[PDB]
Amino acid sequence: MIAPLILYLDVPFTTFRESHAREMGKTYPVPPPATVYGMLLSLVGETNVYRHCGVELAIAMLSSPKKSRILRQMRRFKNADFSHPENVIPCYQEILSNLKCLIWVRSDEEKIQPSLRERIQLAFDHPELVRRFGCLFLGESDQLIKTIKLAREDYLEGVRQWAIRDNRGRLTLPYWVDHVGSRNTRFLRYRIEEMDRLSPPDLAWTMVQSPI
DNA sequence: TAACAGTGGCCTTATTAAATGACTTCTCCATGATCTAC
Structure with missing residues (x-):
């Protein structure tokens, strides 16, 4: 299987x-x-x-x-x-x-080609062929991204705080957001575990699916 | 050519260490019942 794309992010x-x-x-x-x-x-x-x-x-x-x-x-x-x-x-x-x-991106479960991982890889390979509008940001439109780049498993080769899907975890992060109300918003409970692994554990992967 | 290179005694006594008054002013509410227009 193709290795999951790794996207270093600095905001x-x-x-x-x-x-x-x-x-x-x-x-x-x-x-x-x-x-x-x-x-x-x-x-x-x-x-x-x-x-x-x-x-x-x-x-x-x-x-x-x-x-x-x-x-x-x-x-x-x-x-x-x-x-x-x-x-x-x-x-x-x-x-x-x-x-x-x-950020680890794995696109094994996508039914439409090309997959998101392939699209990100192609966008980073030939940035002049990307057709998009506005400036890249994380969160609010004014919070621009400083550094987003393709990296390896050991870009800082230090210690990583993973987000593990734990049913007893504190955080309740949504993998799907309903911007009108809250009917279609879907949640999952996470915990931040301090681990020295260079690859995500199995419970660290979250699949983005429709609320249906 | 020599032998000295100061012997004393003091090293501040008082007194006062702040007196006043102020210690943010405005505004931006949220939500449902009801009025009303289509």
Whole structure:
């Protein structure tokens, strides 16, 4: 079998807001599989979200990012008038600083060719042939990606904080997100285990599937 | 050519170590019952 594609990721600032965190911008410690899947789709310029269902992703944290809060005058659709003062509310948003991680992409379960792994490999091979819009970001549109590159299993050859699918884990990261409400959002429970493995364990792989 | 290279005694006594008053002001609500227009 083809070795799973490894994508080194370095982001200066990242906000993985929680699904139920609407009054305050609480963030996940680790990028959810849904956010990484959306980032990869943006990287290959794929607008359709159902195109690459079945891809498996594994995330290894190269360091523990620090959590910080920033005030923000975020807008909302509360009043019909755009200039009404009710449309602006001040609330906190939690950000993560200096996020470095390695992403494993495995595309054995995809039924549509070419697979997401092949598309990412081709995009990195010939960047001038990639047809996409906007700037690559992880989280919010203003949180641009500093370094995204093809790496090996030992890019830093140090110690890795894996995200293991544990039913007793603390984090509840979604592998599918319903942006309207929460009906179609699908969750999985993870834990961050400090391990010196250079390849993801079996429980570290998360398959992105439709809620159906 | 020589032998000395200071013998003393002191090394601050007082007194006062802050007196005032202020210790953010506004605004941006969320949600459901009801009114109302299509």
